[PDB]
């Protein structure tokens with residue numbers, strides 16, 4: 001079973017505690033010995049990187065299956081992808097909380113971030129077409145990403161607590177994020 | 185001293201665990217019995233309301249003391265007030281984390297929100313003059329506030345982590361927030 005068992009327990013622990021979360025707690029909650037966690041994942045940094053790839057691949061798969069390739073307007077394409085992104089976060093709140101904490105942790109390797117980006121080429125090209133050049137720079141990209149993740153999580157939080165207005169929060173959050181991060 | 189001790193313990197606890205912070209943990213960390221905490225605040229909600237107003241009064245005093253009335257441009261003024269807001273959060277990171285969790289909690293009374301709203305006349309009027317109608321609305325103001333606090337907290341987090349570019353994060357964060365939340 002057990003590699004999956006370790007990834008799910010790391011998901012919940014990091015959602016709750018961020019990377020400050022406990023390999024003992026993780027291994028325990030996965031029903032295995034801690035030295036066993038380290039046989040599957042040689043280090044904590046490798047568990048963090050591997051977990052991030054697994055969670056991003058699930059999120060990406062979920063967005064890709066909803067992609068209407070007929071749309072070519074950058075704003076309309078980005079909107080329908082945001083809808084999908086927020087939907088996944090509403091369905092998997094711990095999985096999203098874990099991605100956001102790992103993303104901003106600066107414990108992700110350059111190789112990991114590029115492999116994550118390559119999971120959704122159309123979104124990476126959308127970033128290239130649409131995001132302000134300052135937020136695509138090496139110096140401020142991480143901040144751009146942090147602002148995006150803040151806006152997306154706040155949208156998920158308001159939507160999750162008031163389902164009746166969820167579609168409107170999702171629409172208002174998209175328009176706010178688009179004005180915040182894109183070319184004037 | 186016991187009430188102030190409970191409010192400082194409550195600040196630290198809610199900064200770390202949100203309104204899910206335990207009243208057992210709060211009281212112990214203040215050096216008092218949970219029973220005594222409920223002598224000062226008969227419900228968890230009354231502690232939330234009182235603590236919110238104490239932290240907002242502190243934040244508002246800090247911004248009012250820094251206000252430069254020589255700044256007659258609405259955007260530049262908003263910007264100088266943003267600078268003071270971020271500066272207060274960098275000086276008091278538990279205070280700003282607690283304010284954000286309390287502000288989005290749905291536990292604040294109508295009367296609490298009204299008292300908060302008229303601690304800073306100049307800001308209230310700038311909000312009325314500048315913010316998009318939808319983020320003033322009874323239905324979506326709370327969401328607008330949540331987006332603002334998410335962008336402000338993210339700006340503080342990046343400035344605190346990478347202090348060599350703090351000024352740049354503060355300026356970029358302001359401009360992104362201004363685009364996200366203000367009128368044509």
Ligand SMILES: CC[n+]1c(-c2ccccc2)c2cc(N)ccc2c2ccc(N)cc21
Pocket residue numbers: 078079080081082083085123126127130131144145148177178181182
């Ligand atoms: C900040 C870029 N950005 C954009 C984006 C925003 C505006 C225009 C184009 C792309 C994005 C847009 C949608 N819908 C869904 C996810 C992402 C995304 C996800 C992760 C990340 N690190 C940056 C991301």
Ligand SMILES: CC[n+]1c(-c2ccccc2)c2cc(N)ccc2c2ccc(N)cc21
Pocket residue numbers: 262263264265266267269307310311314315328329332362365366
């Ligand atoms: C979202 C409104 N808004 C504005 C604001 C934003 C844009 C234009 C004018 C005012 C604001 C501006 C600065 N500098 C500092 C604090 C706040 C603020 C604080 C709390 C809140 N609940 C809304 C807030």
